[PDB]
Design a protein around this ligand. Structure first.
Ligand SMILES: [Mg+2]
Ligand SMILES: [Mg+2]
Ligand SMILES: [Mg+2]
Ligand SMILES: [Mg+2]
Ligand SMILES: [Mg+2]
Ligand SMILES: [Mg+2]
Ligand SMILES: [Mg+2]
Ligand SMILES: [Zn+2]
Lengths: 176, 174, 162, 97, 222, 45
RNA sequence: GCCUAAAAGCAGCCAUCAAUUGAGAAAGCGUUAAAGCUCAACAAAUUCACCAACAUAAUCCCAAAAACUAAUAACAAACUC
């Protein structure tokens, strides 16, 4: 049939949409695919997403190729923030270091793309920096003793006031 | 028409000329192949299999490659750069692995190239790959030189050896 | 000239290219300084739908037009020559430049109406039923407007609409 | 190459293009070779075998297409246009295939 | 292959606050109580004011004469404000609010009896006048493509031009009027009163030079 | 200057004249010179 | 990256980085969301390629006609000789 790209959790591969109807239209079974995915990712921490490529042949057979987990997830974990910032560039989401960026590059280099591309770790580090700046996370050179918490308290106050203002604006739009 | 409004060289074409000059001056193996329109995944896989042997690939536009080649000493490669082209650049040429890695793909043929200022076709590249190494041929050079005196000494010493051989034959017969 | 020859030999098709000899340009052009063929042979504003020997130099054997990138003419004269070739084909000149159909040449039809200096196509014009009055007259066009710059030995302008 | 991609080239067995890169009429030959070796032609059918024979003193480029209708189309393309070769091959495989 | 040409970069163009078009009133705050006469001199002839760019770079040039009222103002305002970029583009009016009153009568009324009632207000626009002038850090092709709609919907014929286009067309006009071949020109004939043609011509033709006839303006008449 | 004439093996008959002139220089020397050259080659390479 | 059930380049808002010679967190089609079809960038060539065209009334359409023999012609009043 061809190639299908998917991003599912480690062990939370349920046979429903938005994954069910795709393989259903293709022809292969959904429960079988879920069983294969769970037995192949049973050692993975349940809850993290990782990209997968499903190659379906004309005889309704399928092969799976799993890559390293999502770089967005890696950056959100390294920063300690669950959901990234809304207004990128205008607000600060988290705080990571070049050490953490190099670590993420080292743990993500062993993937299909960076295996086919003979690139040094500098390219992967630059890509991680780009993804972090897209998420809105600042990357300081070397500053982590308490500044992380000093910014974390202010970020918590900011997100609390942001949620309050969102609820207020929603109530205002409902009343208008 | 009016006289020619001559064109000026731009930074991009200057950089291309400098890059082609550096390529043709620094490295040794410069192979010319037909760039086959393949999928990007297979292209990156071939990139990885070439980087394993540490031989790179480059692609230059014809509009900048034809004048440079016809100006330089490589004017014998003009009929090779008509269609799509791919320049395999290698230091310390080792064509054996290149021929092996191109054999795995049926519709990717080696057009030609130069190995240390020696322009060869596909059969020339095959012969160069089947040829022994430089150290081996240098070691065989002295051997083939002294082979004349070696055969001289062999013929000079075989005359007493013929009697020994006949005696051994007569012993083995009984 | 290149020709494609096809041979059928036991479910095996052999397609080959054969190059023949083509005549070259005349040695002495009257104005070798011109870049365009007609503009240098001084035939500008000289050819017409009647001049068949000039129009027949560049046309396919099936009445088709030859491309400009291969011919070499300037754009204006190329359009004029295309108009002249269309007008000649419609008028009934170039009899040897039609496709041979032995199955369609048998069922003869109504005789071809004698025409010349026709602008449009014979199967795309509707007859004028109102015809207009003197002040608002529906003029009947004859000839191509691209050839209005021909040399007029009589001096009078060419009636492009009558 | 889009024509051969959309024409359904599943009905061909072997396509070989024999040429010499050091000649003066190999432009259309290599163009046809690339058009038949494009990725779309490959993904159309994987059972076909594409071969590119490279010589130095052959001086006569040729294309041999053997397909399972017991058919062998041989085109000695030395002066023909690549587009003409492609359209002739397409018409033939569409008529007999 | 193709050589890379550099992109035009704009940094000295400062986008002012409120870049979109403002709201105009159908009737001004002080409505004219005294009914006026419908002078046609405000349409006849070329425009004298607002013929050059002030701060913007593109404009809607009117090649004819006519009237503009609240309907056209609202059409232009809505179209420009919905198809412009308030972050990189700004617009500005070149015509004032409608002030000239227009009198009307109800159907069934015979001729005479006095003046009608003030129905609406319009803005007189002459040929050669700019209507909307826009600026910003944008190119000319997109603003032209999105302003040609307004230029078409305007009553008089209009074109989406710029400084370069206006200069080019004026240079072409000067070149044509100075390399014209026939020795007889409308201006020369009208000024010399040749053939007694002043009996047919108008005193304003001596200035219009046969280029402006009523409300229509033909730029191809030298 | 220019490069070589791009030869092939389909009609390979022209060898570099430097090889032939070096063979002639070798064959135009006495046995003691050949022994000296062989000793120098075995010492260096 | 956020909201949304889903927002995978495209209801939306903000950022608009990063490798390959070379590919915009994507300028249009397409799905509920996907998928898929395109554009621009490299390698392949490089004819010209910016807007311009628009039905109709009633008794029966209304001189016929003609793109090239030379034209600051000629024929043409109650004008003037
Ligand atoms: Mg209008
Ligand atoms: Mg790069
Ligand atoms: Mg394109
Ligand atoms: Mg109708
Ligand atoms: Mg009649
Ligand atoms: Mg008379
Ligand atoms: Mg009288
Ligand atoms: Zn011309």
């Amino acid at each position: 049939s061809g190639m299908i790209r998917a991003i599912v959790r480690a062990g939370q591969a349920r046979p429903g949409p938005p994954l069910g109807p795709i393989l259903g239209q293709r022809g292969v079974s959904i429960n079988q695919f879920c069983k294969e995915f769970n037995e192949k990712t049973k050692d993975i921490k349940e809850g993290i997403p990782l990209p997968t490529k499903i190659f379906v042949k004309p005889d309704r057979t399928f092969e799976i190729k799993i890559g390293q987990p999502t770089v967005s997830y890696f950056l959100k974990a390294a920063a300690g923030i669950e959901k990234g910032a809304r207004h990128t560039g205008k607000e600060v989401a988290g705080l990571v270091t070049l050490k953490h960026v190099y670590e993420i590059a080292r743990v993500k280099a062993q993937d299909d793309a960076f295996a086919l591309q003979d690139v040094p770790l500098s390219s992967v580090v630059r890509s991680i920096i780009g993804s972090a700046r897209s998420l809105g996370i600042r990357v300081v050179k070397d500053l982590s003793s308490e500044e992380l918490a000093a910014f974390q308290k202010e970020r918590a106050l900011f997100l609390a006031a942001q949620r309050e203002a969102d609820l207020a604006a929603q109530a205002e739009a409902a009343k208008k | 028409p009016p006289p020619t409004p001559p064109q000026e060289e731009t930074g991009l074409v200057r950089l291309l000329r400098r890059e082609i000059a550096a390529v043709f001056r620094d490295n040794r193996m410069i192979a010319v192949c037909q760039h086959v329109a393949l999928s990007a995944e297979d292209k990156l896989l071939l990139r990885h299999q070439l980087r394993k042997h540490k031989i790179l690939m480059k692609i230059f536009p014809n509009q900048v490659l034809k004048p440079f080649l016809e100006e330089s000493k490589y004017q014998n490669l003009l009929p090779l750069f008509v269609g799509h082209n791919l320049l395999l650049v290698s230091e310390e040429p080792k064509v054996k692995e290149m021929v092996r890695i191109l054999k795995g793909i049926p519709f990717l043929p080696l057009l030609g190239g130069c190995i240390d200022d020696t322009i060869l076709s596909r059969q020339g590249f095959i012969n160069y790959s089947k040829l022994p190494s430089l150290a081996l041929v240098q070691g065989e050079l002295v051997g083939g030189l002294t082979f004349l005196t070696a055969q001289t000494y062999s013929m000079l010493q075989h005359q007493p050896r013929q009697l020994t051989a006949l005696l051994d034959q007569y012993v083995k017969q009984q | 000239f290149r020709e494609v020859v096809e041979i059928l030999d036991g479910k095996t098709t052999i397609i080959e290219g054969r190059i023949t000899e083509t005549p070259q340009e005349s040695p002495n052009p009257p104005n070798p300084t011109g870049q365009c063929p007609i503009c240098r042979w001084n035939l500008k504003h000289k050819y017409n739908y009647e001049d068949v020997l000039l129009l027949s130099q560049f046309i396919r054997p099936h009445g088709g037009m030859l491309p400009r990138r291969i011919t070499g003419l300037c754009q204006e004269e190329h359009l004029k020559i295309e108009e002249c070739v269309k007008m000649a084909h419609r008028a009934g000149l170039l009899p040897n430049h039609r496709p041979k159909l032995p199955e369609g040449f048998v069922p003869k039809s109504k005789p071809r109406l004698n025409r010349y200096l026709t602008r449009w196509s014979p199967r795309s014009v509707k007859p004028i039923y109102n015809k207009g009055h003197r002040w608002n007259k529906v003029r009947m066009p004859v000839g191509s407007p691209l050839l209005k710059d021909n040399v007029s030995y009589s001096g009078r302008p060419l009636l492009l609409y009558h | 190459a889009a024509a051969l991609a959309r024409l359904g080239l599943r009905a061909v067995k072997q396509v070989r293009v024999q040429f010499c890169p050091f000649e003066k009429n190999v432009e259309s030959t290599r163009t046809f070779l690339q058009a038949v070796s494009s990725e779309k032609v490959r993904c159309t059918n994987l059972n076909c075998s594409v071969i590119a024979d490279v010589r130095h003193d052959g001086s006569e480029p040729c294309v041999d297409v053997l397909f399972g209708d017991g058919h062998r189309l041989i085109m000695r393309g030395a002066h023909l246009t690549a587009q003409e070769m492609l359209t002739a091959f397409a018409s033939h495989i569409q008529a007999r295939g | 292959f193709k050589t890379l040409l550099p992109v035009p970069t704009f940094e000295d163009v400062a986008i002012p606050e409120k870049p979109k078009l403002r709201f105009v009133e159908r009737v001004p705050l002080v409505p004219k109580v005294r009914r006026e006469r419908k002078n046609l001199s405000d349409i006849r002839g070329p425009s004298t004011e607002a013929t050059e760019f002030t701060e913007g770079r593109f404009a809607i040039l009117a090649l004819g004469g006519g009237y503009l009222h609240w309907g056209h103002f609202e059409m232009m305002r809505l179209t420009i404000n919905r198809s412009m970029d308030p972050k990189n583009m700004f617009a500005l009016w070149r015509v004032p609010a409608p002030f000239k009153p227009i009198t009307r009568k109800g159907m069934g009324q015979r001729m005479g009896g006095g003046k009608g009632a003030i129905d609406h207000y319009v803005t007189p626009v002459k040929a050669g006048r700019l209507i909307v002038e826009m600026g910003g850090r944008c190119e000319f092709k997109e603003v032209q493509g999105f302003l040609d709609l307004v230029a078409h919907k305007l009553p008089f014929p209009a074109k989406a031009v710029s400084r370069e286009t206006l200069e080019k067309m004026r240079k072409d006009q000067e070149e044509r009027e100075r390399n014209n071949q026939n020795p007889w020109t409308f201006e020369r004939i009208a000024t010399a009163n040749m053939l007694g043609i002043r009996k047919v011509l108008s005193p304003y033709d001596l200035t219009h030079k046969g280029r402006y006839w009523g409300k229509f303006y033909t730029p191809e008449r030298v | 200057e220019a490069l070589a004439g791009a030869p092939l093996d389909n009609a390979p008959k022209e060898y570099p004249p430097k090889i032939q002139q070096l063979v002639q220089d070798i064959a135009s020397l006495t046995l003691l010179e050949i022994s000296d050259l062989n000793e120098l080659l075995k010492k260096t390479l």
